[PDB]
Design an enzyme around this catalytic site. Structure first.
Site, short mmCIF file in Angstrom:
data_model
loop_
_atom_site.label_atom_id
_atom_site.label_comp_id
_atom_site.label_asym_id
_atom_site.label_seq_id
_atom_site.Cartn_x
_atom_site.Cartn_y
_atom_site.Cartn_z
N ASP F 205 1.10 -1.29 0.02
CA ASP F 205 0.07 -0.21 0.14
C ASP F 205 1.21 1.60 0.15
O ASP F 205 1.22 2.11 0.75
CB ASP F 205 -1.07 -0.17 1.52
N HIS F 208 -1.94 5.17 0.49
CA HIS F 208 -1.72 6.10 1.37
C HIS F 208 -1.21 5.83 2.36
O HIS F 208 -1.66 7.52 3.03
CB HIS F 208 -2.40 5.17 2.72
N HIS F 213 -0.42 9.84 6.07
CA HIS F 213 0.60 9.97 6.05
C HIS F 213 1.39 11.61 6.24
O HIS F 213 2.40 12.13 6.28
CB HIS F 213 2.43 9.05 6.10
N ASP F 362 -1.57 5.36 11.89
CA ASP F 362 -2.52 4.16 10.90
C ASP F 362 -3.03 3.35 11.62
O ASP F 362 -4.24 2.99 10.92
CB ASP F 362 -1.21 3.49 10.18
#
Ligand SMILES: c1ccc2[nH]ccc2c1
Ligand SMILES: c1ccc2[nH]ccc2c1
Ligand SMILES: c1ccc2[nH]ccc2c1
Ligand code: FES
Ligand code: FES
Ligand code: FES
Ligand SMILES: [Fe+3]
Ligand SMILES: [Fe+3]
Ligand SMILES: [Fe+3]
Lengths: 447, 193, 447, 193, 193, 447
Positions: F205, F208, F213, F362
C-alpha cells in the site's frame, strides 16, 4: 438452536425463556431478524435541519451517517468506506458537502456517491466505475412528525403502518401539539444489560414504579410521588395499557403532564399542558386532547423508548447480549418558551440521563435480570408476563389496539414479545405477516 | 503566554484559565486550597452527604458536569447545542440528590458502596473582581466499588469557585467539569465529582 | 466435540488432553455434567446457626441463597426472582424471614415460598397461583459434620456415599475431634486459571511443594520446611495418597499437625494436636487418632479443597475456562481456645488467603498451565499423571480406597480425572455408575 | 460536625476520623507527613523492602488490611465475624514477607516486577494522649506490572499511626486499610499498601 | 541507607536516587517543584504543545522513555542491548512531534482528544555540582480519552533535571522514564509523559 | 462456514469479504491453515549469537523458546512443560544451558531434552522414559541471511523457495550489503486490529502514504515528503510492485535510501547508501545495486513486514480477530558505523515504534477497518483491491514475479490474498500447491 421451532415466547406472550436476555447466538440472530428487518430511530429534523447537516447513529451494531440532502430529504448510509472498509466519519454531528476517507482519500458526497478518488486518472484511468461504488445506503428512511427512522429491509411496512395502533396515542403530542423537537446532544452510557430489558420496562411496566423508584419518588418532589414504596396504588381508571401488531406499545397515565419532573417544574408544566389541552378540545376532541397531556411510557419496537410529558427519549443500542449503549435525549414542544425548553431538557437529564437519579434505580434490575439469563439453572426458566391476561380487549370504540383498561399490567409486554417471537421465527416480512394474521386474537384469549 | 492562533489545539476557555494561575502565585493559598479539597473529598468518601452540603456547599451554588458532542476539529458551520448537562444543579437540586442517597429504600445503596477519591494538581487564584471568591482547579480520580466485583473509575478536571464564607468555612459556589469520556463505561455518572 | 466418544482422559487416568483447561465449549458442557450433577460446597452450620440466618453461595455459575429454616433444617434456592428474573439478594450474609425483590416487590419467604405480591388482590385478583411460584429450589442439601453441600440433581448418591473412601480419612478431624467450625467471611479473589488446576493441585500434588513453595518454606518458619528448594525428600512412609470412586481424593502427611503455619504457632499446635490424639487413641484406635493429627490435602470432587491441620478451606468457583473465583475460609477445631482460633484463622489467610504468600507461589503455575490449554499447538497435547502408576492398591486392610503408599505421587490425580471422564461422557448418574463399575481395577492396572 | 443519626450512611468509625482532622490544623505537620509518605512509597516502589522495614516500620507495628463481608444496610440481627484479615501483621510477620520477596527461589519475582505508587489526600493530626504519635491518613493508587501484559491497580485509603522515633526517623506503628473491593480482580493482594 | 547487596531486588541506579532525596530536604524547593510540574501538566492537558515547548522545555533537553527487555533476575551472561527508546528526543525532535500534533491533516486529532494528568509523589533536590540544576522526581497517571469509547491510562515515574533558566522560567533539561509495562495495552504511547 | 467452498477472496484477488478481518471462527481456522502451515519470523543471529543464548517468540498464538545450540545451529521448542503444561520460560531473552520448570522442577536442556526430574530414582524408578518427553519441537527452522524463521509443518517448502520471487529483491540489502543486524529489544504494543490489516498495508500500500501520513510527511522532514496531503504524485517509473507464489510481496521506491528518516539523517544515509551502491555496481550489476538502496515495503507472508532503508522490521502477532500484538525492531547494515547504527535504531522507533508518529497515523485506519468486519451489514461486503489489475506482468526480463511497473497500485494485495484463499481452502501443502498451479496466470488476467 432452531429458531423456526424453539418456543422462546409462549402462546399469548405469557412468558419468555430467560435465556433470551443472555444468549449470544440469539443476539446474533436478532441482528438479522430484529435489527436488519425493523424500523430504528435515527435522529430528528431539529438536529439536522439544514442542507449538509449530518449525524452519526447506530442501527443495531452498524453505524450510519444520516444526512440532510440539498432537496430537503434525508438519506442514510453505512459509515464504512467502499474501498478498504475504514470508518468514514469519526464525529457525531456536523455540516459538510461530503466525507473524505482518512486512509486513501476517497471522497463521497452527502448523497453517498463516490465523487473523487485521488489521482484517479493516473492510477485507475477510466477503469473505476464510481457509479457502482457509492456508500451502502439504508433502504428506507421515513419521518413521523420530524422523528426520523431507518430500516435496512426494503420490504418493511411504511413507518406509519408499522406504528399501527400506537400512532393514534402518539399523535396528540407528536402532531396536534404543534410538534416536538429533540434536544441534543444525547447522554451516552453503557449498561451491562440486554437491550430488551429496558425496552420491555418502558413499553409496559408501571408495576415497578412505586417500588423500584421509591427513593426517587420520595426525594424527587414529582406528581406521581404518592406511589413511593407502594404506599398507594393509582386510582380507578388512572390509566390504561396498549399494544399493537408490530410490537409497539405503551402505558397511559391520565393527566400526568409534569411526569417525573420535580416540584420545581410542576406548576409551570401543569399550566402549559392544561392551556394547550383546552385549545385541543375543539380540534381533536376531549379524549385525544386529554391523551396529549397524559404521560405515555412507550416503546417503538424494537429499541426506541420514550416518556411523553416527562420528555425522555431513549435508544437502547445493542452491543452484545449483556451490553447496551443507552442514548438519552430530551423532547420538548416547539411552542414552549425557550427558557422552559432549557429547564425541561436539564430535568430530563437530571432524572433519566447519565447521572439520572431515577434511571439509576433501574440499573441493577436490568443488569441482573439480563445477566441471570446466562446462568445455567435459569436459561430454561420462564420470565412471567401474565398480569391482566384475559382482561384485554381488541377493537374498542374509543381506544384502539389491544388494550388493558387499567393503569398497571403486562398487556404491553405480551404484545412486544409476541411480535418478537414472530420475527425471530421468520425469515422475512411475509413470514412475519403470516405469523401475525391473528395477532390480536392471540393476545385477548380467555377474555 | 498562550496564543491560540499559534497553539492550534487550545480552546479560548482553556487559554483564559492558564492565564489566571500562571500569574500571582501565593503558596499559602495553594496549601489552603489543598486542605479544603482534601477535607471535602474525605466527607464525600465516607458518604457524609448532608455534612458535605452543610459544610462545603454554598446556597448560590451551580454544580455542573457537561458531556460535549464530538465534532470535527475543522467544523465551523454546525451551530446547535454543543453539550448537555449530566449535572447542572442548584442547592435544592443537590439536596434532592442527597436525600435520594440517604433514603432507606434506595435499594442500590445496600450493600454499602465504597468510595475512594484522589485529588491532585491543585491550583488556586483569587478572583480579580470579587474578593470573596477563590478560583481552585484540581483533578480527581474517583473509585467506586460495589457488590463484590463492580468497580468504576472516573477521571476529571474541576474548575471551582469557592467563597470565603463565615467563620473560615469556605463553600463551593461553582463547580464546572467537562467530562472527558463521551460514552460512559461506568454504568452511570451517579457520583459527586 | 462429541463427549460420548472423545478421549479427554486416557485409560487409568494416566494423561489428559491439555485443552481441558482452556476449551470454552467443554466448560459449558461441565456446567451440565459436572456442576449440575455433583455435590458442591455451600456453607457451614457455624455461619448460619440460627433460624433466618442465610448466606449466598455459588453452585457452578449459579448463585443460591442458603437459609436456616425454623425447624432447624437448611434449604437453598436460586437467587433469582420468579417474576422477571432479577437477582433477589445482593448481600453475602444476613438474617431475615424472607427476601423482597427490588424490581416489583414480590416477597419470598426464607422457605422459598412466594408469600406476597404487591397489590395482589387489585391486580391479579385470584389468578396468581403463588403455590407454583416459589423460588427454584436446590434439590438436595446435606451435611457432613456441619459442612453443608448442595446438589441440583435429585438422582445423586447421598453425600456420605459420594465421599466414598475419602470419608474414612476425614472423620478423625471432622467428627472425632469434637467437630470443626468454619471461620468466615472468606477471602475472595479471581485468578486466570481453570477451576481444575487448583482442584488437581490440592487433591494430590505433594511433588510441587518443595520447588513451587521453596521461598515460602524457607522464609515461612514451618514444619514442612526441610523441603525448601528440593533440599530434601520426605522419609520412608512419611505419607500416602488415596482416591475414591466419585473422584474425591487426598494426600496424607503423617503427624504434620502444624501444617503450613509459621514457627510462631508450631509449638502450641503440636501440643494441642498431640494431646487430643492421646485421648483419641482409646476411642478410634492408634491409626485413626494419628490420621486426625496428620496433614490432609484433599479435594472433595469437583471443586472444594482443604488442608486439614493447616486449616485451609477453598472453593474454586468456575467463571469460564480460564477464570476462577477463589473463596478461602479457615477451619478450626471447636474446642480450641478462642485466642488460638483467632490466630489460626489469621494464619490461614496469611499463607493461603488473598495475600497468602504460599498461595501466591502457585499463581503462575495454575494460570499459565490453564492458559496454555487454549494455545493451538498444546490443545491436543497430553498432560501427564503417571507417577506411581502400577504401585497403587485397592482394598487394603488398614487404609481404604485406591491407595499409593508413598507421600509423593499422582494416585489422586488419576482418580479425580477418571471420575471427571466418566461424568463428561455420561448423561446422567446411571450412566456414570455404569462407566464406573470397575473404577478401582482401572486405577490399579499393572500392579 | 457529623451526626450519624442524620447522615445515615456514615459509620461511627468514619465520623470519629473526620473529627480528628477537621480540628487543630498544622500546615507544617501536613507537609512533614507528605514527605514521610512519599519517601516510604519510593522505598517500596524500588522494592527496597529491607530498607523499608529498617527505616519506616516500628517494632510494635500492626499492619492490617481487612475484607468486610457484604451485609444489608438494614441488617441488625446477624452478628458473626464482619471481616477477615488479608493482612494482620506484626514486625516479625512483615519480616517473613520481606524475606519471601527477597528469596532467590521466589520464581514469581523473575522477571522483576515494576511498582508505581501514587499517594494523595494526606492529612495529619497529633494524637491527643500520646505525644509520640501522629495520625496520618492518605489514599494510595498502586500499579503493579509484570510479565509483559499483567497490570493490576489497587486503590485504598490508609489510616496510619506513626511514632516520632529517634533521630527524626519516623516509624509506622499501625496501618489500617478496609479494602474497598470485596472480590479482588488483581490475581492477589500481594502488595504493601 | 540502602545496601543493594542486602536489598537484593534494588538496582544500583534506584539506590543512587534514594540517596539524593533522603538527604538535605528543603520544603520550599519541594513546593516550588510541585507548582512547576502542575503548571507543566496543565499546559499539556489543554494541548498547548507550543507553549509547553516555549515555556517548559530547554534547548539542551533529552526527553527519554525506555522499554526494558524482560530478563531473568539471575541473568549474568547475556549482555546485549537491555532496552529500547520509545522516546529519546532532543529539542528539534520534540518540535517535530509538536508540529505533527498541530497539523490540520493529523486526522487522528479530530475529534479533539481529552487529556487529564495526575502528578504525585513530588521530590526535589539540588544537583551537587551544577547549581543551575534541580533534580525532580514525580509520578504520573495520564488519562487519554477519544472517539467516544477509547480510554487509555498510562502510569510512570519520572526522573527529571530542570535548569533555573532566566526570569524564573524553569526548563526541563532531562526527563527519564523507564516505562513499567513491557507490552503496551494503550494502542500506542503517543503521549507526553 | 465451509472453507472448502466459501469464496472469501474473489478470482485474481480482486476483492475480499470484509468479514475476514472480524470473524473469530475464521481466525481459529487461520491458526491451522495459515499459522501452523507457513514460515514465521523468530529472531536474528544478532540476538542469539552465542551458545546458550535464547529468546522467546510467538508463532501464531503459541509461544516458543528459540535457542542457539552448542554446534552453532538453532532449535526452537514450545514454551510448555511436558509434565503438567506450565509455561517454562517467563523472560524474553537470556543465556542458559537449560530451563527448569517452576512447578515440579523438571529440567530441560537448551536442546529440548528432558535432562532431569527431581528425585527421579526414588519416585519414578526407571519407569520414566525421558527420551520421549523432550519439549515439543518446531519442525523446521531456517535462516535467510541471519533472519531466522520457523514452521510447524514439516511439509513446507524450504524458506528460500517460499520467498519465491521476492527473494531476488531482498538479496541486495540482505546479502550483498554485507548483511544486516537486527537491533533489539523490540517495541511491543497491542492494537485492536486484525493481523491482516497491517500485513496488507506493508505488502503493497503506497496509495495511503500521502494522505494517511500527511502530517508525518510535513512535520517529519523526510525524503518522501513531497507527497504530503497528496500535494504530488510520484514520478514516471518512481517504483514498482511485485508479488509471488507463496504470498510475499513488496513495493519498490527507487533510490529512497533515507526512507522515513527525518532530515537529521538524510545526508548521512544518502551518502552511505550511494557509496555502497557504487561498489555494488561491479558485483551485482546496476539494477540490483540500485535495488539495494531503494526503499522496499514488504511483507513476508503471512505476518512479518519490513521497510528496508528506513530499517523498520515488524511482526504482527495474532491474538484474536480484532487484536494484534505488534513487535517493532530496527534493521541496520552491519558495516555502518556504530554511532549511525544507534541513531538509525532510535529513528526507527521514533517513527514506527510504540510512540512512532508515523505508525500512529495508521492506527485508526487499521483498527476501524478491522472492527467494521464484525458489523452485520459489512460482513458480506467487498473490500476492493483492483487498482492496476490488467497491467501486471509475469516473467519480465529484469524484474521477477508478478510485477506492476508503477509505484502505486494493488498488485501485492492481490498476490497476498490469492495465497491466503489457497491456504484457507486447503488441508495441507499439497492441496495449496494444486490450488496454486496457475498462480501467476490468475494474477495477470486481462493483460
Ligand atoms: C412511568 C410509568 C411507566 C414507566 N415505565 C418506565 C418508566 C416509567 C415511568
Ligand atoms: C501440602 C501438601 C500437599 C499439597 N497440595 C496443595 C498444597 C499442599 C500442601
Ligand atoms: C512507504 C511505502 C509503502 C508503505 N507501506 C507501508 C508503509 C509504507 C511506507
Ligand atoms: S479505505 Fe477509504 S479510501 Fe481506502
Ligand atoms: S422481577 Fe422480582 S418482583 Fe418483578
Ligand atoms: S508442570 Fe513442569 S515440572 Fe510439572
Ligand atoms: Fe424505572
Ligand atoms: Fe501449592
Ligand atoms: Fe502507513
Amino acid at each position: 438452536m432452531n429458531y423456526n421451532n424453539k418456543i422462546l415466547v409462549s402462546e399469548s406472550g405469557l412468558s419468555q425463556k430467560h435465556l433470551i436476555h443472555g444468549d449470544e447466538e440469539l443476539f446474533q440472530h436478532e441482528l438479522k431478524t430484529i435489527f436488519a428487518r425493523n424500523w430504528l430511530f435515527l435522529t430528528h429534523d431539529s438536529l439536522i435541519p439544514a442542507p449538509g447537516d449530518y449525524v452519526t447513529a447506530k442501527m443495531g451494531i452498524d453505524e450510519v451517517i444520516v444526512s440532510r440532502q440539498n432537496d430537503g430529504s434525508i438519506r442514510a448510509f453505512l459509515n464504512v468506506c467502499r474501498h478498504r472498509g475504514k470508518t468514514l466519519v469519526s464525529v457525531e454531528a456536523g455540516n459538510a458537502k461530503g466525507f473524505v476517507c482518512s486512509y486513501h482519500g476517497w471522497g463521497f458526497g452527502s448523497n453517498g456517491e463516490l465523487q473523487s478518488v485521488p489521482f484517479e486518472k493516473d492510477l485507475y484511468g477510466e477503469s473505476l466505475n464510481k457509479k457502482c461504488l457509492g456508500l451502502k445506503e439504508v433502504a428506507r428512511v421515513e419521518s413521523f412528525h420530524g422523528f426520523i427512522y431507518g430500516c435496512f429491509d426494503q420490504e418493511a411496512p411504511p413507518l406509519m403502518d408499522y406504528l399501527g395502533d400506537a400512532a393514534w396515542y402518539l399523535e396528540p403530542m407528536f402532531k396536534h401539539s404543534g410538534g416536538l423537537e429533540l434536544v441534543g446532544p444525547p447522554g451516552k452510557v453503557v449498561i451491562k444489560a440486554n437491550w430488551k430489558a429496558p425496552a420491555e420496562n418502558f413499553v409496559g411496566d408501571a408495576y415497578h414504579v412505586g417500588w423500584t423508584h421509591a427513593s426517587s419518588l420520595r426525594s424527587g418532589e414529582s406528581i406521581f410521588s404518592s406511589l413511593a414504596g407502594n404506599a398507594a396504588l393509582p386510582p380507578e381508571g388512572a390509566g390504561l395499557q396498549m399494544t399493537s401488531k408490530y410490537g409497539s406499545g405503551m402505558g397511559v397515565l391520565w393527566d400526568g403532564y409534569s411526569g417525573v419532573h420535580s416540584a420545581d417544574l410542576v406548576p409551570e408544566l401543569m399550566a402549559f399542558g392544561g392551556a394547550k389541552q383546552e385549545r385541543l378540545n375543539k380540534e381533536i376532541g376531549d379524549v385525544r386532547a386529554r391523551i396529549y397531556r397524559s404521560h405515555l411510557n412507550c416503546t417503538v419496537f424494537p429499541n426506541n423508548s420514550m416518556l411523553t410529558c416527562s420528555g425522555v427519549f431513549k435508544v437502547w443500542n445493542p452491543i452484545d447480549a449483556n451490553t447496551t449503549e443507552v442514548w438519552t435525549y430530551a423532547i420538548v414542544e416547539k411552542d414552549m418558551p425557550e427558557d422552559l425548553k432549557r429547564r425541561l431538557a436539564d430535568s430530563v437529564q437530571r432524572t433519566f440521563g447519565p447521572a439520572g437519579f431515577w434511571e439509576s434505580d433501574d440499573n441493577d434490575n436490568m443488569e441482573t435480570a439480563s445477566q441471570n439469563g446466562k446462568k445455567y439453572q435459569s436459561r430454561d426458566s420462564d420470565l412471567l408476563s401474565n398480569l391482566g391476561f384475559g382482561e384485554d380487549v381488541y377493537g374498542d370504540a374509543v381506544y384502539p389496539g389491544v388494550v388493558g383498561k387499567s393503569a398497571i399490567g403486562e398487556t404491553s409486554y405480551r404484545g412486544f414479545y409476541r411480535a418478537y417471537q414472530a420475527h425471530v421465527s421468520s425469515s422475512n416480512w411475509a413470514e412475519f405477516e403470516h405469523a401475525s394474521s391473528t395477532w390480536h386474537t392471540e393476545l385477548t384469549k380467555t377474555t | 503566554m498562550i496564543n491560540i492562533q499559534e497553539d492550534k489545539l487550545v480552546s479560548a476557555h482553556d487559554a483564559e484559565e492558564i492565564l489566571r494561575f500562571f500569574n500571582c502565585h501565593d503558596s499559602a493559598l495553594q496549601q489552603e486550597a489543598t486542605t479544603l479539597l482534601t477535607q471535602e473529598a474525605h466527607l464525600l468518601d465516607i458518604q457524609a452527604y448532608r455534612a458535605w452540603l452543610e459544610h462545603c456547599v454554598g446556597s448560590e451554588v451551580q454544580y455542573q458536569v457537561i458531556s460535549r458532542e464530538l465534532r470535527a476539529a475543522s467544523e465551523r458551520r454546525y451551530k446547535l447545542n454543543e453539550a448537555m448537562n449530566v449535572y447542572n444543579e442548584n442547592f435544592q437540586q443537590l439536596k434532592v440528590r442527597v436525600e435520594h442517597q440517604l433514603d432507606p429504600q434506595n435499594w442500590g445503596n445496600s450493600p454499602k458502596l465504597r468510595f475512594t477519591r484522589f485529588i491532585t494538581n491543585v491550583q488556586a487564584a483569587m478572583d480579580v473582581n470579587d474578593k470573596e471568591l477563590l478560583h481552585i482547579r484540581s483533578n480527581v480520580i474517583l473509585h467506586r466499588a460495589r457488590r463484590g466485583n463492580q468497580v468504576d473509575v472516573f477521571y476529571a478536571a474541576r474548575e471551582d469557585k469557592w467563597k470565603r464564607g463565615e467563620g473560615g468555612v469556605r463553600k463551593l459556589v461553582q463547580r464546572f467539569v467537562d467530562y472527558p469520556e463521551r460514552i460512559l463505561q461506568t454504568h452511570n455518572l451517579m457520583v459527586f465529582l
